[PDB]
Design a protein around this ligand. Structure first.
Ligand SMILES: [Fe+2]
Ligand SMILES: [Fe+2]
Ligand SMILES: [O]
Ligand SMILES: [O]
Lengths: 192, 192
């Protein structure tokens, strides 16, 4: 069965940008529950033995929602880090400048997309199959994995991701997200 | 321009079932923001002169999302009250018993639907135009007003409705919702 991968840092490592309490609920309750529900829903089914990505690309309904959310959250935790944030360098910086005009342009576009992604969902930096970077949003458990675009960076805009720390101020959460971005992970994703 | 209608009670009236803090944010920030955003989108447009309902039934995208949420929240506050809850009497009791067998069955079914509603949204008791009652769930700003059916009761299951008080425990929030239901309002809705 699928297991909840260990958080890449201590539960308080993202403070004050994302609190230890947010981590305890978001990781320990929400993410854990998606793992448990996924395992239960796939027992005895043709989805047993399949990778998480394989399930995401071949499922609908509850199986999809849980599988995609498991993957999305693991991806999200890796997108964040202590002692990180700031501006990317190298190939990531160059690709962002080429695709959006500048890092500042990208940051504003990503922020705007995330803030205006209505309801629950995720906002993504992806590499489209044309080789160009783009910002796309998804609803609920939706993920670029069901397309031919490669996810590079994401922000969870489900209210549970930020409500403890920012209440209604999703834009405040976005401001603090930038202080946490793990560009090393983004660079790995782009290089792949 | 649209005004945020006054809350039917002070912000502590629903406590401890829904906290004063929740109401301060939910009414004073979320509901207010929907009003502000709606006004900004419709100013100087052909949506001026239209009632809230007329906008909801003739719009899409941002105009729709904001107009529907303004209406949904006003309806929600009217569905809740101090010194209420328990079970309906008279016409409402009769109608629910006729359509669901018993109030207890209705209560279980409504609760189940509300807990299963994935992501942000609303769960409703409606009266169809042939008089049948039904439980329906909607996503995000979705509302029975865009259908033929008449809303009788709703619960908001956006995480902002409960996260301060219940965190991830949406079922706890639902339990406490029942302690607040304003059956007088439900009766008005049914009698219209
Ligand atoms: Fe999440
Ligand atoms: Fe709400
Ligand atoms: O999420
Ligand atoms: O909401």
């Amino acid at each position: 069965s699928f297991e909840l991968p260990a958080l890449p840092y201590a539960k308080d490592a993202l403070a004050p940008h994302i609190s230890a309490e947010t981590i305890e609920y978001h990781y320990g309750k929400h993410h854990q529950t998606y793992v448990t529900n996924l395992n239960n829903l796939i027992k005895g089914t043709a989805f047993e033995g399949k990778s998480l990505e394989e399930i995401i690309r071949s499922s609908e309904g509850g199986v999809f929602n849980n599988a995609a959310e498991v993957w999305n959250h693991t991806f999200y935790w890796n997108c964040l880090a202590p002692n990180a944030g700031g501006e990317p360098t190298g190939k990531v910086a160059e690709a962002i400048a080429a695709s959006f005009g500048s890092f500042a342009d990208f940051k504003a576009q990503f922020t705007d997309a995330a803030i205006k992604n209505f309801g629950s969902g995720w906002t993504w930096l992806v590499k489209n199959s044309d080789g160009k970077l783009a910002i796309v949003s998804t609803s609920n458990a939706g993920t670029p994995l069901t397309t031919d675009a490669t996810p590079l960076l994401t922000v969870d805009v489900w209210e549970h991701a930020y409500y403890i720390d920012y209440r209604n101020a999703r834009p405040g959460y976005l401001e603090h997200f930038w202080a946490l971005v793990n560009w090393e992970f983004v660079a790995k994703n782009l290089a792949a």
